[PDB]
Amino acid sequence: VQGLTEEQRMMIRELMDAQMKTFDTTFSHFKNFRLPGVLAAKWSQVRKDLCSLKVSLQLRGEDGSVWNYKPPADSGGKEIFSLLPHMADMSTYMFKGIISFAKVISYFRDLPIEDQISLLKGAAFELCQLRFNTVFNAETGTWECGRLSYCLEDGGFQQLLLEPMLKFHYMLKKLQLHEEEYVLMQAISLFSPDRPGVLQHRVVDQLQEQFAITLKSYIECNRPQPAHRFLFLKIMAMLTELRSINAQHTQRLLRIQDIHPFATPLMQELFGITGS
Ligand SMILES: CC(C)Oc1cc(-n2nc(C(C)(C)C)oc2=O)c(Cl)cc1Cl
Numbered sequence: 001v002q003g004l005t006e007e008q009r010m011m012i013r014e015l016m017d018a019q020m021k022t023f024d025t026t027f028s029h030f031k032n033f034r035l036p037g038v039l040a041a042k043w044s045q046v047r048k049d050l051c052s053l054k055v056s057l058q059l060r061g062e063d064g065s066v067w068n069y070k071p072p073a074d075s076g077g078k079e080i081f082s083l084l085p086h087m088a089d090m091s092t093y094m095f096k097g098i099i100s101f102a103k104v105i106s107y108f109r110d111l112p113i114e115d116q117i118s119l120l121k122g123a124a125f126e127l128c129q130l131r132f133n134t135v136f137n138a139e140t141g142t143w144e145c146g147r148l149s150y151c152l153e154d155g156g157f158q159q160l161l162l163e164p165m166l167k168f169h170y171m172l173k174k175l176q177l178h179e180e181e182y183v184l185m186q187a188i189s190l191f192s193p194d195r196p197g198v199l200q201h202r203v204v205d206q207l208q209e210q211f212a213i214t215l216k217s218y219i220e221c222n223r224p225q226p227a228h229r230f231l232f233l234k235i236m237a238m239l240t241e242l243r244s245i246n247a248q249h250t251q252r253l254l255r256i257q258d259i260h261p262f263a264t265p266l267m268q269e270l271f272g273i274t275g276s
Contacts, residue, residue: 001180003221008214014105015183022100023131027146033089036069036082042259049252050080052163057086058149071153084262090145092264094128101127102190107207115200122195124270125246126239127186129168134182138173164245172238175231178222184215188239212236 001009024030036057057069072079102108102120111119135144141152141160152160161167177185192198193205216232223231253271257263263273 001218001222004214004217008217011210011214012180012184012218014107015187016180018101018104019179019183019186021104022097024097025135025146027093027148030090030093030145030148033093034085036071036086042255046256046259047074047080049255050074052252053165054153055083055143055150056153057083058151060147060149062147078260081260081262084256084260088262088264088267090148091128092266094131095124095266095270097131098124098127101186105187107187108190111200111203115198115204118195118197118199119190119192119204121197121270121272122192123190123246125249126189126242129165129242129245130182130186130189133169133172134179136169136173138170164241164248168238168241168245175234175238177235180218181215181235184211184218185235185239187211188215188236189242192243 001012004012051074054071056071059067061067071083074080099120102116108116108119132143136142137144141157143150152166161170188208188211191204191208191211193201193208198204215235219228219232250271253263257271257273263271267273268275
């Protein structure tokens with residue numbers, strides 16, 4: 001790129017190579033996953049919690065066959081849980097890729113093991129959502145995950161933007177970010193010094209500032225257009241919003257888990273569930 005220091009260029013290269021090595025953008029190795037079956041104030045809140053993300057599922061076979069799943073309506077029973085095993089398997093697959101991402105980055109490997117764990121626990125969900133945005137089709141409201149597709153169900157478009165996670169995906173897609181800007185967002189999220197349990201606050205804070213400076217300079221050197229004025233500040237605002245979404249989603253997941261267990265072992269580990 002233009003105008004960056006040698007170190008800033010090395011930093012982007014390290015992140016881009018980690019992304020390349022650990023982001024299966026065709027989802028070719030996502031296999032053996034579960035699928036929905038064929039054919040008291042807690043519950044009220046868990047009902048509201050589950051209806052926030054309503055998707056149909058399409059699976060396109062290599063042979064040309066297509067399976068399509070349309071979810072039920074909420075009618076007061078366990079049917080609101082039908083996609084949870086599947087989504088648990090997808091989130092587990094994505095978390096593994098995010099853990100692999102972080103472990104390949106020198107700046108992360110050099111942290112104490114305890115801070116490595118605290119940073120992954122704090123950011124795993126946010127990095128997953130950033131990766132999912134790169135496969136989000138805003139015109140069709142669909143996450144295109146190779147041969148799998150997750151399509152938002154039909155109030156219209158303005159009413160979907162009321163769900164913070166969906167507004168986030170649509171707003172982030174509109175910024176038309178480069179791969180390099182997505183991976184710097186992932187690094188700024190990963191190297192957050194204020195996650196619970198971080199000990200090397202000062203080292204992590206210094207690393208995060210360098211990633212943010214690199215992103216700011218990347219944008220200044222490579223995006224002169226009036227449309228990209230304030231882009232760096234827009235991205236940082238989205239990262240702050242993404243952290244809020246993370247906290248809301250973690251509370252939602254724990255409420256659902258409390259009355260209807262579904263988290264895989266890796267999810268339990270990331271969410272602090274002990275098994276007792
Ligand atoms: C299983 C559920 C309660 O919790 C999660 C779901 C997801 N999501 N979200 C999606 C989109 C938004 C449909 C692409 O796909 C996922 O697997 C992630 Cl990343 C992490 C967790 Cl913990």
